[PDB]
Design a protein around this ligand. Structure first.
Ligand SMILES: [Cl-]
Length: 276
């Protein structure tokens, strides 16, 4: 009963789903906690852009560098054949772009080139990994850039996480325990402003529900396996309180609409329990 009933209900929902689904929920201002299939390592995909953002903002805070500081981005950096609004906008590259514009593209629109530019700025994947670990959150592995991930099929598996780790990280962020007030406000806004993943965490929630989130997606291999279909974030309840949730649908044989629906239904079931 109570939380246990919710977990069981979610478990029942997942029994006929041909995927490995991981779930974690953490209440922001209360003691609520939920975990389903927590132990497993789930591939992050674009969800890791959130962590990267924390690292860049943290670097800016420490070095007292403005978010308006411009970085010259070489043409070679704006790789083709990858999702990049930045490349589309600046096809010839060789342009000076503010960190703010780069961050916005990376977090709000999942820009791959933007993510790699930022990884360079903070010093590489290991630096981000260290930064996250040093925050007291274990079980998150960050080893590959977007460029690297676009090669072999199994590179994406090297960027992994447990669901609970994500939720712990989100809560710390949401409570403004990691960055400065200015940086926190900015990142949060970018997370709310996004139009990605409308059928995921947000899909069955009521119109007007504020959700700050970051999506993650993958390709489908020739055996019909979609490696990752993810959505992570902070949701605002009707009473004004919040909860962090992370859902990873991994190694799925299901159709793309089903994978999104799984995230949506699971979130909806959590929401209903929490509202009550
Ligand atoms: Cl923060």
């Amino acid at each position: 009963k109570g939380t246990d009933s919710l977990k069981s209900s979610i478990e029942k929902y997942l029994k006929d789903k041909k995927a490995k689904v991981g779930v974690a929920v953490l209440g922001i201002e209360d003691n609520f906690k939920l975990n389903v299939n927590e132990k497993h390592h789930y591939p992050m995909q674009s969800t890791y852009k959130f962590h990267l953002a924390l690292a860049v903002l943290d670097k800016l805070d420490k070095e007292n560098i403005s978010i308006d500081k411009k970085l010259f981005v070489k043409k070679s950096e704006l790789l083709p054949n990858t999702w990049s609004p930045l490349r589309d906008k600046y096809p010839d590259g060789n342009v000076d772009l503010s960190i703010s514009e780069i961050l916005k593209a990376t977090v709000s629109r999942s820009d791959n080139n933007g993510c790699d530019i930022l990884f360079r700025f903070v010093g590489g994947t290991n630096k981000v990994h260290n930064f996250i670990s040093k925050l007291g959150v274990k079980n998150i592995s960050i080893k590959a850039t977007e460029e690297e991930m676009h090669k072999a099929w199994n590179v994406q598996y090297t960027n992994w996480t447990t669901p609970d780790a994500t939720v712990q990280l989100l809560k710390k962020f949401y409570k403004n325990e990691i960055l400065s007030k200015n940086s926190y406000d900015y990142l949060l806004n970018t997370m709310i402003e996004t139009t990605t993943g409308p059928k995921r965490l947000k899909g069955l929630l009521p119109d007007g529900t504020v959700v700050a989130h970051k999506t993650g997606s993958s390709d489908t291999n020739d055996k019909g396996i979609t490696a990752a279909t993810n959505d992570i974030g902070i949701i605002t309840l009707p009473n004004g309180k919040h909860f962090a949730i992370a859902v990873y649908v991994s190694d799925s044989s299901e159709k793309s609409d089903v994978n999104e629906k799984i995230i949506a239904e699971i979130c909806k079931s959590v929401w209903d329990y929490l509202v009550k």
